[PDB]
Amino acid sequence: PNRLIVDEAINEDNSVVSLSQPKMDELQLFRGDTVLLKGKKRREAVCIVLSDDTCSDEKIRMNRVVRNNLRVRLGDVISIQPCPDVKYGKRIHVLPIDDTVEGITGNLFEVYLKPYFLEAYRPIRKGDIFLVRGGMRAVEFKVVETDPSPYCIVAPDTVIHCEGEPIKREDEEESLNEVGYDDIGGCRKQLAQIKEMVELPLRHPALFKAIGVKPPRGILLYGPPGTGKTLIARAVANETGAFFFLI
Amino acid sequence: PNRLIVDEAINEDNSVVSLSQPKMDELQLFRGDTVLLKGKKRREAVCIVLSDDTCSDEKIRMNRVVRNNLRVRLGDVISIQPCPDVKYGKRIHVLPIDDTVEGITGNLFEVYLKPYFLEAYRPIRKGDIFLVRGGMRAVEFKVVETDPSPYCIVAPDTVIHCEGEPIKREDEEESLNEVGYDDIGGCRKQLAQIKEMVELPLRHPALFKAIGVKPPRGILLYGPPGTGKTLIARAVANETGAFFFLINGPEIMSKLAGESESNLRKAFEEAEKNAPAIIFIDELDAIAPKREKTHGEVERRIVSQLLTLMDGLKQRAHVIVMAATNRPNSIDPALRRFGRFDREVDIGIPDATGRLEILQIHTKNMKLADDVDLEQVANETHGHVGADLAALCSEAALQAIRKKMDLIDLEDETIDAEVMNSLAVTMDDFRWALSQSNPSALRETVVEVPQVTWEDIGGLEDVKRELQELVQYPVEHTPSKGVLFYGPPGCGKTLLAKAIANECQANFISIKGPELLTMWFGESEANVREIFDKARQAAPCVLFFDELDSIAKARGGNIGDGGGAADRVINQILTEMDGMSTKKNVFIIGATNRPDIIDPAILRPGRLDQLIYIPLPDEKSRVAILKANLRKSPVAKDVDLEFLAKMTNGFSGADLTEICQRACKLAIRESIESEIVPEIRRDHFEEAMRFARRSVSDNDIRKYEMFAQTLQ
Amino acid sequence: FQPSPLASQFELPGDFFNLTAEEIKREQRLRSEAVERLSVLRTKAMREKEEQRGL
Ligand SMILES: Nc1ncnc2c1ncn2[C@@H]1O[C@H](COP(=O)(O)OP(=O)(O)O)[C@@H](O)[C@H]1O
Ligand SMILES: Nc1ncnc2c1ncn2[C@@H]1O[C@H](COP(=O)(O)OP(=O)(O)O)[C@@H](O)[C@H]1O
Ligand SMILES: Nc1ncnc2c1ncn2[C@@H]1O[C@H](COP(=O)(O)OP(=O)(O)O)[C@@H](O)[C@H]1O
């Protein structure tokens, strides 16, 4: 009950999750409402739900940033619940991650965090990692301290701090600048074919052991140089989490 | 007396065997009676006896499950002892075999044992091992307790129990999932050829140890990958009991000098120690490539070591060596010298019937929906081999699995048997898999029995009888082994060759102008020998060389370059024909539209001695042609086919077909336009008559008639 | 009728499973003839003449 398969999203926004309307009406989770997503290791993420005409009833569409925070991967199943009583915050303390702020200086708040939270009403939770783009760099930020807990809505009238040493990255989270499916442009049909052939043998290895069917043994990608052959191979391994060895 | 030789089953069911009715009459038992079978090592099994029209009078047909319980093999002898005293059981305890229950859980009785025995009334004996298929898994069980003893009949009121750990298999018992003869679909003739050559020295070694004459030492299986070359080699070893040693080129070639040759000769020594044995060397062209293609010492020395190891087989009694290649001419020719690998079998590509049989084998464990039509699939999968049909079944299963598992969401080490039991593969899942599958054998020529029969050819009643007599006479009573057809185009020359092959159930090999030209253009006329060798391997077959003068015309025809009537390819054809006997069951048919410019050697005694003229159809034949072309479509009663035939006085059969297709197209267009009529009306034929024209002029007919009278 | 359990109790001779020269040559001859029959090029009339023998 209220357990849906994690899928890819078209909307790249980090505060947006898309669900098919029949489930939004059945669960009383309507466009604009704030919803919680339950991931692994008793972790959760907060976001705003929108409708579309592309999501399946049994799936939830989200981007890489949300899946990383939930410690989930495409094809798994997560629990969804509304939280209409979420309130606005008052004080938000955000720090950059040192892995992404290197060789650059200046006021990161005015360039990155300020337009990110400028009348956006984004839902944040303590410990969330989110990516803000600009200046030809992609800088990751973490929410490290808030007055409300464990989550709130960031209103334009709140006070956002960006002072102190950058925060270290934890070993349990992956970099948001790593190659994923959102880095592949054309040949989306080819990627879909590969995903169907590769993601399930690796995501649910017990399923192929349990069912008497032979998995694919190898995929040859051919075409001119510079088309994304090596890009797909990396994106698939990074999205599924399988150990990657380069030859 | 009361003893029969064990043979293969036709009915795959595990509780029944088939006898020839005269033996059931001698034993005074009826179809459905329960009998005991006495095998080796004082073992017995209980089964039901039926009969059919194919079992030999002196043989008993039983499947692998029955043979394994008796610990007997094909070619052995058992006794039949009716046991009418068998009664119904009260309680039977059945437990699975561990080797097949791994990764699967749930209530095995409800999924497998219950529907298997329910209202089946199968005989059961304590210790029996049997297989129940389902849920994409093959799970076999053993009987550990029976309230009656030592055997009984299961009834709907019999208690079936199943509690306890899976049973470990005995070392003398083989798994029912191991490849055997029942896992091979098409190429049944090739399998029979291997049986004749291989089973005797392995089942009856005493016949060859008493004599100084050795059986064939090596068999080379060739054809496209994925056709069963290794499957046959393994199935034969598993059915006869000979030890199977697997060798392949890459495994030996990946080794360094010394280690490579050592491993190759070591395997041969092991085969003698474990004789009788079969040594299968895959990728023979990789382990023994032609020496002129490499300068490495390792490649040449390995060939030398294999050549001596093959010669040593006269000492290694009861060891047979088989090898697989893509083509017989892609390997070092030394291996094909007298002895060694002087025997070869062409596996080929399965036809529509063989492809269906292969699909039926792969789907044995699959739950199919009522909409699944494997025959239609086999008809569409042209150019596919068994390896591709296996992938097709796997992909269709995987698509069905994804559709349900996304909703089941069972994440554990094992899968419930119940959720697999409800999983079915539909036609939409096969259709999807067909779109994703791509044949691996699409470039090679596909040879099969044609679908054109005599009812598809209008007119030429005397030519039909002539061809039937030419093939039937040497069988019912030097007979000719070929015929040349000449006359106008579009009169049925090709259809005649197909129709005789159809009725004879013979393979039809079609050689067309472009193929004759390709050999000439590329100076590869030696490929003609391979065509004739294919005709022998495909026997019975009809070897049809169309457009015999296609090369002479390509070289000028009426003008001419550096050549004339003869060319590289026709001279190779003449050479090969002299090497084919009338007993090879190959009928060679030629056709030309210009018999005056074809090398006359083809008609000389011993070759295409029969010569038949095919004129334009007459009035009654033209009506027959129209009726044959329209036999597959609804036609209105107002269509006067005799009127059309009376007008189309100079038309060929091909021209009458164009008229039919024109009227058909018009009828379809009208129906489509009305929906956005259900049968072809006279108006559609009358419109077609306004555009259809004769393709054969009166001058061309005179050319053919004068030729016919010149030769008589 | 009433079956008697004693009818199912019989022990084979030890030489039962040892096939003779005639039984082994007959089987090998039938194997060669079966391969030859698959190779024969014949019309439907000849095929039916053989099949019809069992009717
Ligand atoms: N289909 C594609 N979509 C997006 N970016 C691509 C695609 N193909 C190539 N690129 C980009 O071009 C570069 C290709 O470099 P490389 O990693 O060597 O890949 P390739 O295997 O194409 O040579 C990368 O920067 C990659 O992001
Ligand atoms: N003639 C055939 N009949 C049945 N199955 C076949 C046939 N040819 C190939 N197959 C199937 O295709 C696969 C062949 O792969 P493999 O074992 O490597 O044999 P090979 O490559 O020598 O044909 C197996 O799954 C086998 O069951
Ligand atoms: N005697 C005939 N009876 C029925 N149809 C014919 C006849 N002759 C020719 N045709 C039509 O002409 C077409 C081509 O025939 P084909 O035998 O291939 O000609 P060719 O041997 O000259 O290539 C066939 O599809 C058939 O419909």
Side-chain angles (χ1 to χ4, degrees), chain B residues 600-621:
Chain B
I602 65 173
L603 294 176
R604 286 174 69 198
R607 294 192 177 91
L608 304 180
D609 290 345
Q610 299 296 311
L611 179 65
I612 298 173
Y613 176 48
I614 305 300
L616 291 173
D618 64 11
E619 182 172 328
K620 70 182 188 284
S621 297

mmCIF file of all heavy atoms in Angstrom, chain B residues 600-621:
data_model
loop_
_atom_site.group_PDB
_atom_site.id
_atom_site.type_symbol
_atom_site.label_atom_id
_atom_site.label_comp_id
_atom_site.label_asym_id
_atom_site.label_seq_id
_atom_site.Cartn_x
_atom_site.Cartn_y
_atom_site.Cartn_z
ATOM 1 N N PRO B 600 25.495 -26.665 -75.361
ATOM 2 C CA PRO B 600 24.694 -27.881 -75.569
ATOM 3 C C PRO B 600 25.171 -29.074 -74.759
ATOM 4 O O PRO B 600 24.466 -30.087 -74.696
ATOM 5 C CB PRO B 600 24.860 -28.139 -77.070
ATOM 6 C CG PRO B 600 26.166 -27.503 -77.407
ATOM 7 C CD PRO B 600 26.221 -26.275 -76.537
ATOM 8 N N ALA B 601 26.353 -28.986 -74.144
ATOM 9 C CA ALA B 601 26.862 -30.103 -73.355
ATOM 10 C C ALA B 601 25.871 -30.534 -72.286
ATOM 11 O O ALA B 601 25.843 -31.704 -71.894
ATOM 12 C CB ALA B 601 28.204 -29.735 -72.723
ATOM 13 N N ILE B 602 25.040 -29.605 -71.803
ATOM 14 C CA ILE B 602 24.131 -29.918 -70.709
ATOM 15 C C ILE B 602 23.097 -30.966 -71.111
ATOM 16 O O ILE B 602 22.551 -31.654 -70.244
ATOM 17 C CB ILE B 602 23.410 -28.648 -70.223
ATOM 18 C CG1 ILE B 602 22.507 -28.091 -71.326
ATOM 19 C CG2 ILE B 602 24.419 -27.600 -69.778
ATOM 20 C CD1 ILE B 602 21.638 -26.938 -70.881
ATOM 21 N N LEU B 603 22.821 -31.115 -72.403
ATOM 22 C CA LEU B 603 21.849 -32.088 -72.878
ATOM 23 C C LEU B 603 22.471 -33.409 -73.305
ATOM 24 O O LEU B 603 21.742 -34.305 -73.743
ATOM 25 C CB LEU B 603 21.065 -31.495 -74.055
ATOM 26 C CG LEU B 603 20.158 -30.304 -73.720
ATOM 27 C CD1 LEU B 603 19.522 -29.773 -74.996
ATOM 28 C CD2 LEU B 603 19.096 -30.740 -72.719
ATOM 29 N N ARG B 604 23.789 -33.554 -73.199
ATOM 30 C CA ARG B 604 24.456 -34.761 -73.651
ATOM 31 C C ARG B 604 24.144 -35.928 -72.716
ATOM 32 O O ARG B 604 23.827 -35.724 -71.543
ATOM 33 C CB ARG B 604 25.961 -34.549 -73.720
ATOM 34 C CG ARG B 604 26.433 -33.687 -74.879
ATOM 35 C CD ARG B 604 27.889 -33.403 -74.795
ATOM 36 N NE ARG B 604 28.687 -34.596 -75.024
ATOM 37 C CZ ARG B 604 29.985 -34.725 -74.686
ATOM 38 N NH1 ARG B 604 30.615 -33.727 -74.106
ATOM 39 N NH2 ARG B 604 30.626 -35.853 -74.936
ATOM 40 N N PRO B 605 24.209 -37.163 -73.217
ATOM 41 C CA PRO B 605 23.764 -38.312 -72.417
ATOM 42 C C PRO B 605 24.420 -38.330 -71.047
ATOM 43 O O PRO B 605 25.620 -38.079 -70.903
ATOM 44 C CB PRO B 605 24.202 -39.511 -73.264
ATOM 45 C CG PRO B 605 24.190 -38.999 -74.662
ATOM 46 C CD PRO B 605 24.697 -37.586 -74.546
ATOM 47 N N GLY B 606 23.617 -38.636 -70.026
ATOM 48 C CA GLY B 606 24.095 -38.686 -68.660
ATOM 49 C C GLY B 606 23.805 -37.441 -67.858
ATOM 50 O O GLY B 606 23.972 -37.455 -66.635
ATOM 51 N N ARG B 607 23.399 -36.359 -68.509
ATOM 52 C CA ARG B 607 23.077 -35.095 -67.863
ATOM 53 C C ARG B 607 21.588 -34.817 -68.040
ATOM 54 O O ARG B 607 20.758 -35.639 -67.637
ATOM 55 C CB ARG B 607 23.895 -33.955 -68.449
ATOM 56 C CG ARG B 607 25.392 -34.047 -68.202
ATOM 57 C CD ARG B 607 26.085 -32.779 -68.544
ATOM 58 N NE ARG B 607 27.507 -32.840 -68.244
ATOM 59 C CZ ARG B 607 28.457 -33.231 -69.114
ATOM 60 N NH1 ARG B 607 28.125 -33.595 -70.333
ATOM 61 N NH2 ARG B 607 29.726 -33.253 -68.742
ATOM 62 N N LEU B 608 21.228 -33.670 -68.618
ATOM 63 C CA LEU B 608 19.821 -33.283 -68.742
ATOM 64 C C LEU B 608 19.226 -33.951 -69.982
ATOM 65 O O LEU B 608 18.892 -33.319 -70.987
ATOM 66 C CB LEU B 608 19.683 -31.759 -68.843
ATOM 67 C CG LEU B 608 20.309 -30.956 -67.695
ATOM 68 C CD1 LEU B 608 20.087 -29.469 -67.933
ATOM 69 C CD2 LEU B 608 19.693 -31.396 -66.373
ATOM 70 N N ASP B 609 19.084 -35.275 -69.880
ATOM 71 C CA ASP B 609 18.657 -36.079 -71.019
ATOM 72 C C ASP B 609 17.195 -35.847 -71.375
ATOM 73 O O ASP B 609 16.785 -36.072 -72.518
ATOM 74 C CB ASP B 609 18.881 -37.566 -70.730
ATOM 75 C CG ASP B 609 20.355 -37.947 -70.689
ATOM 76 O OD1 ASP B 609 21.162 -37.170 -71.142
ATOM 77 O OD2 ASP B 609 20.660 -39.010 -70.206
ATOM 78 N N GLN B 610 16.386 -35.406 -70.412
ATOM 79 C CA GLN B 610 14.981 -35.088 -70.678
ATOM 80 C C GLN B 610 14.866 -33.642 -71.139
ATOM 81 O O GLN B 610 15.510 -32.752 -70.588
ATOM 82 C CB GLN B 610 14.118 -35.319 -69.433
ATOM 83 C CG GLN B 610 14.118 -36.753 -68.932
ATOM 84 C CD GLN B 610 13.506 -37.714 -69.933
ATOM 85 O OE1 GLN B 610 12.414 -37.477 -70.455
ATOM 86 N NE2 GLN B 610 14.207 -38.808 -70.207
ATOM 87 N N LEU B 611 14.033 -33.400 -72.149
ATOM 88 C CA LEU B 611 13.870 -32.051 -72.673
ATOM 89 C C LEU B 611 12.399 -31.765 -72.943
ATOM 90 O O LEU B 611 11.784 -32.393 -73.810
ATOM 91 C CB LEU B 611 14.682 -31.873 -73.959
ATOM 92 C CG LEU B 611 14.586 -30.493 -74.622
ATOM 93 C CD1 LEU B 611 15.206 -29.445 -73.708
ATOM 94 C CD2 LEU B 611 15.289 -30.525 -75.971
ATOM 95 N N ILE B 612 11.833 -30.808 -72.212
ATOM 96 C CA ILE B 612 10.399 -30.555 -72.218
ATOM 97 C C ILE B 612 10.164 -29.116 -72.650
ATOM 98 O O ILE B 612 10.781 -28.194 -72.103
ATOM 99 C CB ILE B 612 9.771 -30.804 -70.834
ATOM 100 C CG1 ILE B 612 9.945 -32.268 -70.424
ATOM 101 C CG2 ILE B 612 8.300 -30.419 -70.840
ATOM 102 C CD1 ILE B 612 9.500 -32.564 -69.012
ATOM 103 N N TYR B 613 9.268 -28.925 -73.611
ATOM 104 C CA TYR B 613 8.834 -27.601 -74.028
ATOM 105 C C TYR B 613 7.628 -27.168 -73.204
ATOM 106 O O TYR B 613 6.698 -27.953 -72.992
ATOM 107 C CB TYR B 613 8.503 -27.582 -75.522
ATOM 108 C CG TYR B 613 7.946 -26.264 -76.007
ATOM 109 C CD1 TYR B 613 8.580 -25.077 -75.671
ATOM 110 C CD2 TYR B 613 6.800 -26.241 -76.790
ATOM 111 C CE1 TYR B 613 8.071 -23.872 -76.113
ATOM 112 C CE2 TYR B 613 6.292 -25.036 -77.235
ATOM 113 C CZ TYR B 613 6.923 -23.854 -76.899
ATOM 114 O OH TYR B 613 6.416 -22.654 -77.340
ATOM 115 N N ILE B 614 7.648 -25.922 -72.742
ATOM 116 C CA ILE B 614 6.533 -25.350 -71.991
ATOM 117 C C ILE B 614 5.917 -24.238 -72.833
ATOM 118 O O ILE B 614 6.427 -23.110 -72.836
ATOM 119 C CB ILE B 614 6.989 -24.797 -70.626
ATOM 120 C CG1 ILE B 614 7.723 -25.880 -69.830
ATOM 121 C CG2 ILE B 614 5.795 -24.272 -69.842
ATOM 122 C CD1 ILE B 614 6.881 -27.099 -69.535
ATOM 123 N N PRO B 615 4.827 -24.505 -73.547
ATOM 124 C CA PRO B 615 4.175 -23.453 -74.330
ATOM 125 C C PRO B 615 3.315 -22.547 -73.463
ATOM 126 O O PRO B 615 3.122 -22.768 -72.268
ATOM 127 C CB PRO B 615 3.324 -24.245 -75.328
ATOM 128 C CG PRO B 615 2.968 -25.493 -74.593
ATOM 129 C CD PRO B 615 4.189 -25.804 -73.769
ATOM 130 N N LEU B 616 2.803 -21.501 -74.099
ATOM 131 C CA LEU B 616 1.801 -20.666 -73.461
ATOM 132 C C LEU B 616 0.554 -21.495 -73.166
ATOM 133 O O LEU B 616 0.228 -22.416 -73.923
ATOM 134 C CB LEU B 616 1.446 -19.473 -74.355
ATOM 135 C CG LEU B 616 2.546 -18.415 -74.520
ATOM 136 C CD1 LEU B 616 2.114 -17.395 -75.565
ATOM 137 C CD2 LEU B 616 2.814 -17.747 -73.181
ATOM 138 N N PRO B 617 -0.163 -21.204 -72.082
ATOM 139 C CA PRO B 617 -1.369 -21.976 -71.764
ATOM 140 C C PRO B 617 -2.461 -21.769 -72.803
ATOM 141 O O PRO B 617 -2.642 -20.666 -73.324
ATOM 142 C CB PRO B 617 -1.783 -21.420 -70.397
ATOM 143 C CG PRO B 617 -1.173 -20.061 -70.355
ATOM 144 C CD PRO B 617 0.117 -20.204 -71.120
ATOM 145 N N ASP B 618 -3.189 -22.842 -73.098
ATOM 146 C CA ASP B 618 -4.356 -22.739 -73.960
ATOM 147 C C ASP B 618 -5.564 -22.271 -73.152
ATOM 148 O O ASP B 618 -5.470 -21.995 -71.954
ATOM 149 C CB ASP B 618 -4.658 -24.085 -74.624
ATOM 150 C CG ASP B 618 -5.029 -25.170 -73.624
ATOM 151 O OD1 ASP B 618 -5.242 -24.848 -72.480
ATOM 152 O OD2 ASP B 618 -5.093 -26.312 -74.013
ATOM 153 N N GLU B 619 -6.715 -22.204 -73.826
ATOM 154 C CA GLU B 619 -7.904 -21.595 -73.231
ATOM 155 C C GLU B 619 -8.320 -22.285 -71.935
ATOM 156 O O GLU B 619 -8.586 -21.622 -70.927
ATOM 157 C CB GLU B 619 -9.064 -21.631 -74.227
ATOM 158 C CG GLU B 619 -10.346 -20.978 -73.724
ATOM 159 C CD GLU B 619 -11.402 -20.864 -74.788
ATOM 160 O OE1 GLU B 619 -11.051 -20.712 -75.933
ATOM 161 O OE2 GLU B 619 -12.563 -20.929 -74.454
ATOM 162 N N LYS B 620 -8.385 -23.616 -71.940
ATOM 163 C CA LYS B 620 -8.795 -24.322 -70.729
ATOM 164 C C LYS B 620 -7.741 -24.193 -69.635
ATOM 165 O O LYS B 620 -8.070 -24.128 -68.443
ATOM 166 C CB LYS B 620 -9.063 -25.798 -71.030
ATOM 167 C CG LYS B 620 -7.817 -26.610 -71.350
ATOM 168 C CD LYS B 620 -8.167 -28.052 -71.684
ATOM 169 C CE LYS B 620 -6.918 -28.911 -71.817
ATOM 170 N NZ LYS B 620 -6.217 -28.677 -73.108
ATOM 171 N N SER B 621 -6.469 -24.127 -70.022
ATOM 172 C CA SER B 621 -5.418 -23.907 -69.039
ATOM 173 C C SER B 621 -5.470 -22.496 -68.470
ATOM 174 O O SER B 621 -5.279 -22.313 -67.264
ATOM 175 C CB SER B 621 -4.060 -24.157 -69.665
ATOM 176 O OG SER B 621 -3.931 -25.493 -70.069
#
